[PDB]
Amino acid sequence: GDVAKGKKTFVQKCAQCHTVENGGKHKVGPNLWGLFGRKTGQAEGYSYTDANKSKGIVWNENTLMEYLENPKKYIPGTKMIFAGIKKKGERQDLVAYLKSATS
Ligand code: HEC
Structure with missing residues (x-):
């Protein structure tokens, strides 16, 4: 149900760039493994200084609305x-979308 529509938007703006299966493998955005437990940073190879880190943080139910909002104002300067x-x-x-496909 409304997780159908996330993957629809997921093949429309998040699809062609991230991978998605178990460590899928990077290619622009690392694998997005399991949003649920981690702070921003450390995920199997990173790259970059302030952004993502800088601010330094947590992936949680919120903070992805936090991001989902718009990557301008919020860890403002993400290289995505x-x-x-x-x-x-x-x-x-x-x-x-990320709580049904990521876990
Ligand atoms: C559909 C809207 C997309 C979603 C949802 C996410 N992204 Fe991205 N994304 C991109 C990059 C390059 C990063 C990592 C690099 C950098 O910005 O510093 C990311 C990262 C994420 C993260 C990061 C998770 C973590 O901290 O490990 C999330 C939650 C996530 N993105 C969501 C680049 C791209 C991108 C390429 C053009 C696209 C179209 C999307 N991201 C789309 C989504």
């Missing part, structure tokens, strides 16, 4: 090229 996602509809659904 993104436009937006600044809507309740698509932004809610994402946060379900």
Whole structure:
């Protein structure tokens, strides 16, 4: 159900870039393994200084709305090229997308 729609948006803006299976393997964004337990940083090879870290943090139910918001204002300076996602509809659904596919 509304996790269907996350992967739809997932093949539309998150799909072609991240991998997704067990360590899928990097290629632009590392594997996004299991959002649920980790702070920003340390995931199997990183790269980069402030951003992601800098701010330094936690992946949690929130903070992915936090990010999901728009990568401009928030760890503001992430090297991931993104436009937006600044809507309740698509932004809610994402946060379900990562809790059904990631774990
Ligand atoms: C669909 C909207 C995408 C979602 C959801 C995520 N990304 Fe990305 N993303 C990209 C990069 C390069 C990073 C790592 C590099 C850097 O910004 O410092 C990421 C990282 C994430 C993270 C990071 C998780 C962690 O800390 O380990 C999350 C939660 C995640 N992204 C969500 C780059 C790209 C990207 C390429 C163009 C696309 C289109 C997306 N990201 C899309 C999503």
